[PDB]
Amino acid sequence: IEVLKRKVIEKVQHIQLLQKNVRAQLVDMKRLEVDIDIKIRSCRGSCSRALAREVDLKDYEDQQKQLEQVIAKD
Amino acid sequence: RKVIEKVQHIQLLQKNVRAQLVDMKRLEVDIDIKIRSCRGSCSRALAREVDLKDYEDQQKQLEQVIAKDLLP
Amino acid sequence: VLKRKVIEKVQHIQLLQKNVRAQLVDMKRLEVDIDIKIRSCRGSCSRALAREVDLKDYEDQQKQLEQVIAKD
Amino acid sequence: RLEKELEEKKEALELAIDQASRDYHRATALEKELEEKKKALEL
Amino acid sequence: RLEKELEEKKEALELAIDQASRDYHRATALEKELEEKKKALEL
Amino acid sequence: IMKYEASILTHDSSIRYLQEIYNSNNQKIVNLKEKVAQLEAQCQEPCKD
Amino acid sequence: EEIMKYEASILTHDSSIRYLQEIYNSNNQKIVNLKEKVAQLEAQCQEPCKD
Amino acid sequence: MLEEIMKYEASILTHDSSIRYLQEIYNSNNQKIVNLKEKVAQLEAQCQEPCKD
Amino acid sequence: HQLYIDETVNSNIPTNLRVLRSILENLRSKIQKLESDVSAQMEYCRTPCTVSCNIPVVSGKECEEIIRKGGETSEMYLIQPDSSVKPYRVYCDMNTENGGWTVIQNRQDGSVDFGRKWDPYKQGFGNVATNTDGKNYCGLPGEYWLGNDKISQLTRMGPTELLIEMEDWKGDKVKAHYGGFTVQNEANKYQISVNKYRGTAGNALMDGASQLMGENRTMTIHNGMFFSTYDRDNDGWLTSDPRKQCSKEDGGGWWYNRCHAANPNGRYYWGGQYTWDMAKHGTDDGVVWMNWKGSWYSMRKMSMKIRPFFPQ
């Protein structure tokens, strides 16, 4: 209880910061995923051809419903 | 709501079943031929029949069954 | 650049698949040398670790890495 | 020079993370397949 | 050398390889359970 | 209405199971297609003279 | 007995949070190195169709 | 056509990095093996003295 | 009180590692795709796209003179408003209401980058038109912005009206007529000014956001406001912090108040609806016309056409 509660606090601070730091990186990858799909299409008006591609958004928001459904208690 | 979502499955299914019922015809033939095509390679040849009347009897069905759907 | 960059990989999987029998053997030696040297303590220390040592495993995955240098 | 050579060869590694990744994906894809089959079996 | 020394040993990094490993075995177990399940089933 | 929400299940098993047979057959077929390709090579040789 | 795994089962969790943190720091590096590869797809997509 | 010879440099990317990795498990093993032998040299000079009387 | 032992806080921490790893490795395999792509295009972009834009014979001064000169189908005609002013290409709409429309800004497929500096907004950018089927005149319009140097002089010729058309991603269209339109020069920082609104879109240049009120509706008015690009900022913010810029990197050039009720030179968001996390800066930077769709909707199409005003 001092070699056990000094871990399920020291390894719970480590997880709960991490999720918050990953959540931040999940947002930033949405930006880039979209920012790119834009800049890519903005090429047709310059280049031989243009890469016919999509963004899977239902996915970016599916695992963003998670992380926000898992942040309950520590 | 639910009973409507069923047909979407129960038709993607039945359109897939006729697509398989096709190949089971194309194969049964492709097989009857490729075995016949052994008569002159192998000592023995498999004495067989092909009942097609069955395939076109249950192709008679399925289609005769493909009614409307849910539109009107 | 296809014949060039494949027989330049089968080049790698024998300078590093004979270094796999090299280390598989060296692991038979240690697995054994240690059962010896464990009991060599049965007359020095409180207890001795009641342990088994398996070989029908070591010579199982010695037969495979073997018959896998027949074909080149 | 004295150090930086063996240094950058150690960025290995992402090879392994990607190797983990390849393996993770090979694992999960298997789990999905599994449970489906279980249900189907029961079915 | 003042800093390059310690950062090197951090890149001496096994938990990666071991996490590949923790996962390889994981997968190979699943294959075997599945193959049996595929036989399930078909039976 | 009571079992008009129960029969959607009695008739949902009979979808996932029908799809189950189908998917097996489509695998069983792609399997017998290998075993024919193995009877092709076996029937190319002219009778032994 | 139940205090034995309660800390050996935590050394498998220590080297998981330490592994997951190792992805994050690689990901973050591969992201900075995508953005400079994109600001070069920008350079290339300015001139209009050639007449 | 070129269709075959397309995922044949996309196939042997994998095979260059599976090998650059198998030579990586191994190189770890041949560094753990040697690091287990040193710990054995210490189970040796612990099994020389005979039973205390 | 030693029921203070939790086994369940080491039997559901595996859970925070199923989800938390799935996520991290989904994003490693998302950076995977977005690497191949930005490198496949990079390859395509070794050679440019090409057009054969054969000119029609019938010039003019603007696109009315030309329809009155018998040039009677929509395509790209070469024009010249002034004899000292070297002539330039342009697309002319000869089909909307009664033709005569000189097109100045068009959007339809996000095929041109609009987030540009101050200079290439003054000059102009984009493709004016392009070839089509079995023909040799460019009978289809490009995405482009005619230019500030150009649209200034083209309006300071007399009575210049202005049409604004747009489409949502469902197939609905709405017009935004402005019977008057003026744009000053560079020394006067291309200051807009408009009057006589009518249409189904909703006055958003003079009135502002039709969902902001009073002081809030006051600061969403482009009318009389200057023109600003991400490298030259002349917006309504006299809070001097470059943190309070209307036009931030990769954002369009436009007549920015504090900041906008609509922005046709915004970024082209596929699908229509976009959100906080999608926008490179959190801002509402897309192709927005608030008075019709809201603040987080970017338009499928968005044209800007002009015509002189003879007492109708």
Radius of gyration of chain F: 22 Å
Multimeric status of the protein: part of a larger assembly
CATH architecture of chain A, by name, is: Up-down Bundle
User: From the helix content, strand content and strand pairing of chain A, which structural class follows?
Assistant: mainly alpha
Number of helical stretches of at least 4 residues of chain F: 3
| Number of strand elements of chain F | 0
**How many strands, what sense, and barrel or not for the largest sheet of chain A?**
none
What is the 3D shape of chain A?
elongated
Globular, elongated, flat, extended or rod-shaped: what is the shape of chain F? rod-shaped
**Strand share of the residues of chain F?**
under 5%
Number of domains of chain A: 1
- Supply the helix-strand structural class of chain F: mainly alpha
Largest interface: A-I, 42 and 49 residues
Strand count of chain A: 0
Please state the CA-atom Rg of chain A, rounded to the nearest Å.
20 Å
CATH topology of chain A: Single alpha-helices involved in coiled-coils or other helix-helix interfaces
What fraction of residues of chain A sit in β-strands?
under 5%
Percentage of helical residues of chain F?
55-70%
PDB class: cell adhesion
Keywords: cell adhesion, virulence factor, streptococcal toxic shock syndrome
Entry title: BC1 fragment of streptococcal M1 protein in complex with human fibrinogen
Chains A, B, C: fibrinogen alpha chain
Can you describe this structure?
The structure is cut from a larger assembly and holds 3 copies of chain A, 2 copies of chain D (43 residues), 3 copies of chain F and 1 copy of chain I (312 residues). Helix content of chain D is 81%, strand content 0%. Chain D has 43 residues and is mainly α. The longest helix of chain D has 29 residues, at 14-42. Chain D starts with a helix and ends with a helix. By secondary structure, chain F is mainly α. In chain F, 63% of the residues lie in helices and 0% in strands. Chain F has helices at residues 7-10, 13-16, 18-40. Chain F starts with 6 loop residues before the first helix and ends in a 9-residue tail after the last helix. Chain I has 2 domains: 54-201 and 301-311, Gamma Fibrinogen, chain A, domain 1 (Gamma Fibrinogen, Chain A, domain 1, Alpha-Beta Complex); 202-300, Gamma-fibrinogen Carboxyl Terminal Fragment, domain 2 (Irregular). Chain I contains 7 helices and 13 strands. Chain I is globular and about 95 Å long. Chains in contact: A-G, A-I, B-F, C-H, D-E, D-F, D-H, D-I, E-G, G-I. At the A-I interface, helix 1 of A face helix 1 and helix 2 of I.
